[PDB]
Amino acid sequence: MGPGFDFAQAIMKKNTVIARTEKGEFTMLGVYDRVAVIPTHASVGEIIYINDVETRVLDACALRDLTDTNLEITIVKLDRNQKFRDIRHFLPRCEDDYNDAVLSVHTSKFPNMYIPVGQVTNYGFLNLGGTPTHRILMYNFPTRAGQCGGVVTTTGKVIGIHVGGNGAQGFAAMLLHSYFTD
Numbered sequence: 001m002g003p004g005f006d007f008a009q010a011i012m013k014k015n016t017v018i019a020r021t022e023k024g025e026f027t028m029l030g031v032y033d034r035v036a037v038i039p040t041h042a043s044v045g046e047i048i049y050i051n052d053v054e055t056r057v058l059d060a061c062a063l064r065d066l067t068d069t070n071l072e073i074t075i076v077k078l079d080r081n082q083k084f085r086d087i088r089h090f091l092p093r094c095e096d097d098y099n100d101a102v103l104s105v106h107t108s109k110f111p112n113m114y115i116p117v118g119q120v121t122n123y124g125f126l127n128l129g130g131t132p133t134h135r136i137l138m139y140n141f142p143t144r145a146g147q148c149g150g151v152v153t154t155t156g157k158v159i160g161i162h163v164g165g166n167g168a169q170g171f172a173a174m175l176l177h178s179y180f181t182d
């Protein structure tokens, strides 16, 4: 509908896949080469389905901060025969608040879904499903099960992936440029 949705659509069309684990189907953001991200509660194993193709996992790392606190991001390297468009230049360097964000989702249950969520707060600490979690972004939109792994963008920035909600608010884990130095 406008330039925020234009940027969101460009990320979804080239830099997402449908990831299936034993815990469900998730939007999965490809960042560069064969490296993608997914919420840690997806419980990635040795094998994952990527667009319904059986795929070996070459590496999976559940990120924590230097306080040894959950960040709810898992970085996955996939045994896939094709590289992602490198979008690391769209990742913020520091923790921040944002105006006018879009949460975008693409699964078999939730195809071609775009949600204008408005203002995004640097929330920080969240007890997420009982797990102390840091670097949480918050938006005032009633997100639902199946939106996990959804991409949060503003024009020219990929800022987070959706990891939970409380019925009234939605919560995303930050993506930072420093997670993807190779």
Ligand SMILES: NCc1ccn2ccnc2c1
Binding pocket: 109, 110, 111, 112, 113, 114
């Ligand atoms: N219940 C499935 C679904 C899929 C895509 N959507 C886009 C907007 N609302 C929906 C709902």
